[PDB]
Structure formats: structure tokens, C-alpha cells
Ligand binder design. Structure first.
Ligand SMILES: OC(c1ccc(NCC(F)(F)F)cc1)(C(F)(F)F)C(F)(F)F
Ligand SMILES: OC(c1ccc(NCC(F)(F)F)cc1)(C(F)(F)F)C(F)(F)F
Ligand SMILES: O=S(=O)(O)c1ccccc1
Ligand SMILES: O=S(=O)(O)c1ccccc1
Lengths: 232, 238
């Protein structure tokens, strides 16, 4: 691992740690978790999502190479990546012992909790299978952080005006992850491929998420403004 | 070095490819011809019909191919259907890319026929699907894949355990793995100095998932313009 690779990785891990501290040390400002409570558990979920979106935008801004893309490309990359980063983070926050997703102490969510928020079967089960598959890979914080950076610099997102530049920005992160995994687990050649394959799954999960949003609109459950900008 | 089994798995796929591609040359003159000689909506419809007809041929070759991949026919039939339903357009996009010619900026299909970006537009498709297809083909060309690499990628694509409605995803993952390992060892040998080729190949699987969605948006949009899929395509993609 070169000096520049160490600096890039260390910067990503420190930014991930600062973003978590900034966004999820204090109690989140959310509708208290209780027709009456169907709208309220949904709102709750929606306010959590907004807090994660904010965290993700904060993190993206600190990824070397991002804030130097053209502004429209920044927006286009974040628009597509957001739900996928959320799925990764949800997998990070997953606890196989309890089968729940922990944001901080006293804020955890199970498959049942998701159903009560109005969410379909078609969205919940993939989320939870993907989370437990992520755990069997046993990614550490550097691996997650690098995977997020790679995810952001995907040159095939809709409305990207400079795909050549995005792809060149992705390469160093791919190279760092390749090196990192070679050093960590030298006798585990499929670890790295297995990680990239989860990026595939994340594209599908994004579509399945969009279907949840469209389905929610059918129960007069609209996304609030900060999420509407991104998803409907 | 590739083991005997890896060499045979590749040779098997590459030769199934060929026996399946026999339907392409024999159905070529049966197809609704591309219309020559047209003013500005007759010809629009004939071009589209032409496109649906080649897609049908492709659907059938992909079905025939998959039945030859070892272990496929031992999957539960509902799972066979679910993998093909999802993989079909993605394999077609791989085949489209494989046939892209950068000199003419045209795609070959079924041996002799070729299509430009503007031919796709003339057949009623929209820029939101067409541009990504051609960028993907250009990107695929820069990787310089050979017949073995494409065949391995298609097998990897078929055996994607995370398709919708798959009932035994673990049985699918178990079939995929040796193909992934074969591709890793293949690229390592072919290009020992290019460590990023293999990751870039895997990332083409990511792009294929998005293109699949864009294709669904294209089919939706085509119905607005009197262009509904025929029965065999309807059941896979509507
Ligand atoms: O967009 C929603 C959403 C729910 C959960 C998440 N995060 C959980 C996970 F796993 F999807 F990432 C993100 C968005 C919402 F509205 F709740 F925020 C959805 F319910 F409509 F799908
Ligand atoms: O589904 C269609 C289709 C068109 C071209 C292809 N193959 C070209 C490529 F690049 F997508 F693979 C496949 C399906 C159709 F209808 F022509 F078959 C679409 F036009 F509606 F999209
Ligand atoms: O953040 S998001 O990811 C999320 C929304 C709702 C519950 C858990 C996680
Ligand atoms: O086969 S499909 O792929 C295809 C449809 C139309 C033109 C070229 C290729």
C-alpha cells in the first residue's frame, strides 16, 4: 500500500467516522415511534431517511475528486447513489444477533417495524437478505468506505455529462480496494470480486426502492420535499 | 494455468454459442425486411416489427443456449424461467456490444444486418435508451474481450442468484462461482500486467442492470406510440 493509498483510505475512514458523529450522536429529530400510527411510523422512517441523506451528502463532499466534478454531475451521481449508499449503511448497521438495524442506542428496527411503516413485502425482504449477505463478507470500515466511493463514481448514471472524468475518478479507489484486500486477505481471491458483485445487486435494489415509492403514492403516502427532490 | 476443467467449461460455452447461433443465419431471410425507399408512418412500423422479430430470434437462442449450460436444467423450472426472464435483455446487450463496429459506429446482428444509432431512432426507440446502448458498446470494445471472456460473462450473468422470484438462490450462486473463478484465471493469464481488466468486466454486470431498467422504460414509452410488444416479447418484458 503506497503513501498516497494510505492517505486516501485514512481520509475516507475518518470522514465516515466524523459524519456518523455529526449526524447520529444526538437524538434524531423524529416523530416519536408510537390509521393513527400508520402515518406516524411512515413519517418516522421518512425523517430517518432524510437524516441519512444529509449524512451521505456530507460524506460525498469529503471524497477526494467529488467537489471538483461539475455541479450537475455531482447532483446526478448523488441522486442515483443515495439509496444504494443507504442500503450499504443499513447493512453496516445490521446486527445478525438481533435481526435489526441500529442507528444509535435505542433506535433499532426489525422486519415487523418496516411493515408497520406502510412498506411492501417486495422491498423489505431483499433489504434484509442483502444486509445479512453483506455481513458474511465481513467488510471492515476501510472496505465499506472504499466501496462507497466506488459506488459514487459510477460513470453510467443518468444525466452524467462527463462520464470519462467520472470513470477516471473511480479507478484509484478500485485500485486501492484491490490492494487493500490483497494485503488483508491474501489467500482469499474472491473477496474482492464478491464486493464488486454487491454493486450489481444494489442497482436492482434501487429499482425495487423506486417501486416502493410509486406504491406508497397509491396509499396517499407522498415523499416529503427533501426526499421528493431525489426520488419521485 | 487454466485447469482442464476450466478449458472445457469455456470450450463448452463457446461451442454452444455456435450451435445456438445457427437459428440466426436460418431465420435471417424470414424476417420482415428493413424498409428501403421510405418518405417521412408505415415505414416506422415496419422498422419496429423488424426489431421485434430479431429480438424474438434472440430470445429463442438464449433459451436454447441456457439449456446447454451444465446444471441449468437441474434448477427448478420456475427458477429457470426467473433467471431467463431477467437475464435475456442483458445477454442481448452483451451480444449487441460484441457486434459493435467502431469504424462505422454500427451494430451487427444475425450475421449480415447492421444498425446505426439513427436506425434505432427510426424504429421508434428514444435517445434515453439508444445512447447508453452505444456507450456501453463502445466501453465494451475498449476492454477488448474475446469469445471466451464473453461466453464466461454470459454464463455468470445467467447464474445471478439475486434475480426477482428465485426460490433457491443458493443453488444458483453455486453454479455461478466456477464461472467467476474461470474468468479470473483467464484474464490473469491473458493479461498478467492489467490487474484492472477483471474488475472492469464485473462492473459491466452493474451497468447491465441499469440498462435492463432503461429497457423497461423504453418498452413502456413505446406503447404510447402504438407500438406494443408481440406475444413472445410481451410475456418477458411487459
Ligand atoms: O423512500 C423510503 C425509504 C425507506 C427506507 C430506506 N432505508 C432502508 C434501506 F434499507 F432501504 F436502505 C430508504 C428509503 C421512505 F419514504 F421511507 F423514506 C420508502 F419507504 F419509500 F421506501
Ligand atoms: O424490446 C425492444 C428491443 C429493442 C432492441 C433490443 N436489442 C438491442 C439492445 F441493444 F438493447 F440489446 C432488444 C429489445 C423491442 F420491442 F424492439 F423488441 C424495444 F425496442 F422495445 F426496446
Ligand atoms: O436511513 S435509511 O437507510 C433507514 C430508514 C428507515 C429505517 C432504517 C433505515
Ligand atoms: O437481437 S436484439 O439484441 C437486436 C434488436 C434490434 C437490432 C439489433 C439487435
Amino acid at each position: 500500500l503506497t503513501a498516497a493509498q494510505e492517505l486516501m483510505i485514512q481520509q475516507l475512514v475518518a470522514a465516515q467516522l466524523q459524519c456518523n458523529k455529526r449526524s447520529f450522536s444526538d437524538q434524531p429529530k423524529v416523530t416519536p415511534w408510537p390509521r393513527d400510527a400508520r402515518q406516524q411510523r411512515f413519517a418516522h422512517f421518512t425523517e430517518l431517511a432524510i437524516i441519512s441523506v444529509q449524512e451521505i451528502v456530507d460524506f460525498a463532499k469529503q471524497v477526494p475528486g467529488f467537489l471538483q466534478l461539475g455541479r450537475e454531475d455531482q447532483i446526478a451521481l448523488l441522486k442515483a447513489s443515495t439509496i444504494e449508499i443507504m442500503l450499504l449503511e443499513t447493512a453496516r448497521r445490521y446486527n445478525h444477533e438481533t435481526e435489526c438495524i441500529t442507528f444509535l442506542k435505542d433506535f433499532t428496527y426489525s422486519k415487523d417495524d418496516f411493515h408497520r411503516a406502510g412498506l411492501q413485502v417486495e422491498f423489505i425482504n431483499p433489504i434484509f437478505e442483502f444486509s445479512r449477505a453483506m455481513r458474511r463478507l465481513g467488510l471492515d470500515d476501510a472496505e465499506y468506505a472504499l466501496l462507497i466511493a466506488i459506488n459514487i463514481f459510477s460513470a453510467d448514471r443518468p444525466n452524467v455529462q462527463e462520464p470519462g472524468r467520472v470513470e477516471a475518478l473511480q479507478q484509484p479507489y478500485v485500485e486501492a480496494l484491490l490492494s487493500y484486500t490483497r494485503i488483508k486477505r491474501p489467500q482469499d481471491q474472491l473477496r474482492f470480486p464478491r464486493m464488486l458483485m454487491k454493486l450489481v445487486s444494489l442497482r436492482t435494489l434501487s429499482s425495487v426502492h423506486s417501486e416502493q415509492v410509486f406504491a406508497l403514492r397509491l396509499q396517499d403516502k407522498k415523499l416529503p420535499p427533501l426526499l421528493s427532490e431525489i426520488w419521485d
